[PDB]
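One such shown below:

_____
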Amino acid sequence: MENFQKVEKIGEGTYGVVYKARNKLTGEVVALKKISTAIREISLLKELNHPNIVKLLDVIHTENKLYLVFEFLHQDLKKFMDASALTGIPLPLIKSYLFQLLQGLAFCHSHRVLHRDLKPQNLLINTEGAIKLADFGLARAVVTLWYRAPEILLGCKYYSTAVDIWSLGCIFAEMVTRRALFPGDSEIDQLFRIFRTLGTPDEVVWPGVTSMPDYKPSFPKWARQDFSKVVPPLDEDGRSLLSQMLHYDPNKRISAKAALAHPFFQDVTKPVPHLRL
């Protein structure tokens, strides 16, 4: 856009290209995403400001096009995990990232705003130890299924803030194990990977599940596995929190606020990562 010089293509998300760009009236370096209800929704997001949410600087509807101007961060968690693959992210850094993302979510959720599409590529990091949620509230306004809550996969139309806790729990496990927890390549393959690990859900563990739109009585019935086998060598506190974040019933699943009081975070700190830019 006339005021912005494109520097580099950062990504080609579901919603449009994202470029690193430089503003000319200010010299600021930004991320520029090229995309009336959508405009009004998007405008609401300009006010949803928190230190763990990527700042939306400006929303330009010009030439009948939509550009979102975000603060720029230098690395995403996907690339940081790929870079830490041989050693693993240190637990204290895992714990700090998790706590910070929970603070982000607790904030958004308290305003009834859901992310809906959390994934390592949408979690951005800086040199100061911060992690932030990117593309927040845009879903309202190949796609990876790996982080999708089971209520979404079973066709619930009116899903809740719990869907974000599910996604962050999947990311948490991935930080710890250095492998995606549920790497499905179709909706049914995503659902069956979840069932193979957590057991096929039923009315005992999830009241009303059998009435969900895409629920089928013919689903194979797998027994649950042990978290000690899912995320070794995470400690008992981490495994307890993880289990609560991956409850099938969205109403039993831990909230962001309650997760912040979990004993896992008794000793949380804010380390600085080793970042090569």
The two ends are 26 Å apart (CA to CA). The chain has two domains: 1-74, 75-275.
